[PDB]
Amino acid sequence: FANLPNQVHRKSVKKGFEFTLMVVGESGLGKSTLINSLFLTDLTVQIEASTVEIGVKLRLTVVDKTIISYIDEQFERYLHDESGLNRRIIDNRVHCCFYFISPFGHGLKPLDVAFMKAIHNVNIVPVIAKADTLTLKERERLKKRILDEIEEHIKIYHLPFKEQTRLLKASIPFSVVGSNQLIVRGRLYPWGVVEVENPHNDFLKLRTMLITHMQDLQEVTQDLHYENFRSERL
């Protein structure tokens, strides 16, 4: 039989992939420079699609109660296409959300909480924006106090060798730096060179967290859309 996972695997490369991630934070603490760095190409609601090969369809919906509305509009178009006489169906259900928190804050701000309370029923990855601004000791205090406030209020993406993947689940929320310019890519200060893909900055754990977990497809599919389905169909 063992040739049948093969069949699935051979099927997927032939066919696939698709994905749609959503970017909220605050204009501007490095969101469009970082989402560009993520995938090694460059690019009120505005949406942008583009393909990568190595085959991946990305719809990076950058958000430039209106957003509770769009992502939930998409639960509604898919409940529509399912039901549903002739089915082919293109799901632009947002697989993941990337909430950028700014490094100036003892803090996680009230807006950030207010928002995540509203949008935590899609998968949220909290990401600390522009971490070149943070000292190591400073980075640590911020990371812990964010996580602390999260259990104090907020469903988040509960994230599914061992020593290595423990470290990944630990360092969340990832602090990161983005840039298209390179000198090694590239933040040039007359005292030092900020170097993405090191930790230095948390860019590799996030980028690799995103790639290994594109079973966010399922989390979003089963947990969050069904609940809109159970909900409006009542």
Next chain:
Amino acid sequence: FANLPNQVHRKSVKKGFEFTLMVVGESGLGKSTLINSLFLTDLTVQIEASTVEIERGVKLRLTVVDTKTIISYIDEQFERYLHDESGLNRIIDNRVHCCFYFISPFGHLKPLDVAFMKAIHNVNIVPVIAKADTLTLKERERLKKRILDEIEEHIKIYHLPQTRLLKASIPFSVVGSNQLIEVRGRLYPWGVVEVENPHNDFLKLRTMLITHMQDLQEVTQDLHYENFRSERL
């Protein structure tokens, strides 16, 4: 005859000397720590007045601002004085000699800021970009030019009268810390950021102020007179 300048130089140290500075920006992009770095001591409207020696003692008052409430307070000081100046006996005047407005490195000049500065600048404004280590040097100057072009588009900032090099570097982009590593500065694992090095532009601002506490007269003649010429009418 020209000890007479020495007669004035002596009287001034023996009395000297006292100043008040006002802080507005945005909690928190480094305003409370920078100002500590600047005088070398750690410290709705709130004021902290502390006394510093160096033979001259400076009576430094520091009125930090947290968030129409602000112009009210800066102006009350004008009316406290107009009452007091015009009173029968003679006054301890807390007019705001000068304000540092703190602009954030997270802008390609924000609209709260232009709107705020518009209303107020009849108080001397020092525009200072906060936490300057955030900006790479090309972003540092590119941002400086956008503000500097945006500032004139509307805004009276405080006009600064080898004073040659300071004129260009304003608005200042400062980097404040009260930790200390291998001389004040910050510890990143790729490099080390020095307070006071230009590199930082904290030094240019530091001396901009000590060298100019003729901000004292600017307030007294131009800003207060007009409150007075105005409120009298």
